[PDB]
């Protein structure tokens, strides 16, 4: 855990509260990822680093990136993670829609990782392809738990501003401060669609455009199928109704691969507007689309 234990190599990626470098453990000769978090004496320790570190000993799972050590130097905490060759966003950019056998295998692993989080009562709250790490062997692991949060715990504050916009659930966009596991499941649906077509399912530029894009495809909230929608602050009963679109006809044009009924059923299970009707990660793992893996 000394600073000199790891050699810093090339920069890998950049975020608001961290820069990730490739690194090398000088003793084992094994690659690591060095996530360097700037420490500004006048601003304090970022909450993202503290939350991520709080999970490092407990959330251990094959489909979750391992955090090995935390190193404090002047103006800097370095979080030492297992090294992963790529993330989903770059693996795809590296090509854009993936073949379906890969899509299923990546979705399987994402949901295994997520089921373990939810079993521990932790919400990830920033699932998106960039935060899904992949290695040569095709292992996929959830990364970047900076926004993660325990649920079932008496809180005073809430950010409906969590989750990257494109992957953010409609109930959240409409001001819900009471989502639980459903928040990540929505993101998983958007990721699945993006793997199939190669394009973000709902590429909003702001909060209003995001909901507009969601309702265009999924239809407007139906108060009979979602009575609780009236409790959301930004819900508007006076918008014109729109029926759902045919999800397959929306996706199919963008891939040469046949989208079957099992796959489309699955996707509909993840992308329900009413958060209560979304599949749990555990349910989703046992959906017929995943039959072969058993």
């Amino acid at each position: 855990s000394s600073s000199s234990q790891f050699k810093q190599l090339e920069k890998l990626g950049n975020g608001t509260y961290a820069t990730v470098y490739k690194g090398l453990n000088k003793t084992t000769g094994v690659y690591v990822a060095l996530k360097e978090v700037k420490l500004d004496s006048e601003e304090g320790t970022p909450s993202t680093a503290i939350r991520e570190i709080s999970l490092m000993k407990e959330l251990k799972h094959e489909n979750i990136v391992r955090l090995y050590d935390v190193i404090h130097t002047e103006n800097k905490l370095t979080l030492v993670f297992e090294f992963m060759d790529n993330d989903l966003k770059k693996y795809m950019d590296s090509r854009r829609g993936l073949e379906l056998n890969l899509v299923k295998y990546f979705q399987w692993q994402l949901l295994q990782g997520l089921a373990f989080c939810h079993e521990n009562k932790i919400l990830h709250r920033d699932l998106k392809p960039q935060n899904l790490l992949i290695n040569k062997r095709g292992q996929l692991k959830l990364g970047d738990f900076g926004l993660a949060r325990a649920f079932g715990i008496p809180v005073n504050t809430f950010s409906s501003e969590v989750v990257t916009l494109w992957y953010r659930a409609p109930d959240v966009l409409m001001g819900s401060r009471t989502y639980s596991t459903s928040i990540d499941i929505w993101s998983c649906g958007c990721i699945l669609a993006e793997m199939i077509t190669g394009k973000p399912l709902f590429p909003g530029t702001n909060d209003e455009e995001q909901l507009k894009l969601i309702f265009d495809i999924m239809g407007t909230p139906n108060e009979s199928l979602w009575p609780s929608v009236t409790k959301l602050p930004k819900y508007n009963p006076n918008i014109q109704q729109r029926p759902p679109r045919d999800l397959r006809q929306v996706l199919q044009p963008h891939t040469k691969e046949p989208l079957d009924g099992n796959l489309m059923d699955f996707l509909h299970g993840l992308l329900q507007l009413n958060p209560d009707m979304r599949l749990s990660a555990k349910q989703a793992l046992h959906h017929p689309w995943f039959a072969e893996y058993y």
Binding site: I50, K57, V70, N120, S159
Partner: protein
């Protein structure tokens, strides 16, 4: 495996129906008992020099203007936190100072001194809010409440974080519960 401090606590335990005043009292009393225990023992201390150096940041040369109890009143008067904040704060000090041995017997890991208490309270409360709340008070506001510089506040957050991050820290109902259950256990030996 779980944090050894949780051995014996039902996995489905319920969040304690505890009040802010009781949360605050349990926090203070945990500190008082650790202080008591620390006067009997000569502890095995830290696994590294790193942790020793971080820990020395807690030592405050001069006597605080306010007692522990009054300082805690000032913090709560100014910040108005939920009881959960202090339960987590209590567990942070629990996990820094206590473990269990092979026979599930509680053991003191490090000596706590009175000159370390004031800055320890500052760090545990601040770290607790950042583990728990999506919105926390500004670094400026919290510093002024605690009567320290922003630079010191940062130094204290990181010192406590480095000192406890080798233990299992994930916020959960069982850790909330443990804060009170460990106090009862300590209480029973003193």
């Amino acid at each position: 495996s779980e944090n050894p401090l949780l051995h014996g606590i039902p996995v489905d335990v319920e969040v304690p129906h505890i009040s802010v005043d009781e949360a605050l009292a349990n926090f203070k009393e945990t500190i008082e008992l650790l202080l008591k225990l620390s006067g009997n023992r000569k502890c095995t201390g830290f696994n590294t020099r790193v942790e020793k150096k971080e820990y020395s940041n807690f030592y405050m040369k001069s006597k605080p203007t306010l007692s522990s109890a009054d300082f805690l009143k000032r913090i709560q008067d100014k910040c108005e936190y939920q009881p959960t904040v202090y339960l987590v704060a209590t567990f942070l000090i629990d996990t820094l100072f206590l473990t269990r041995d092979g026979n599930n017997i509680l053991q003191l890991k490090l000596n706590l001194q009175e000159k370390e208490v004031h800055r320890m309270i500052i760090a545990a409360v601040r770290l607790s809010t950042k583990l728990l709340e999506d919105f926390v008070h500004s670094h400026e506001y919290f510093s002024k409440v605690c009567g320290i510089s922003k630079r010191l506040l940062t130094k204290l957050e990181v010192s406590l974080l480095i000192c406890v991050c080798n233990t299992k820290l994930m916020v959960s109902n069982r850790k909330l519960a443990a804060s009170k259950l460990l106090l009862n256990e300590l209480r029973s030996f003193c």
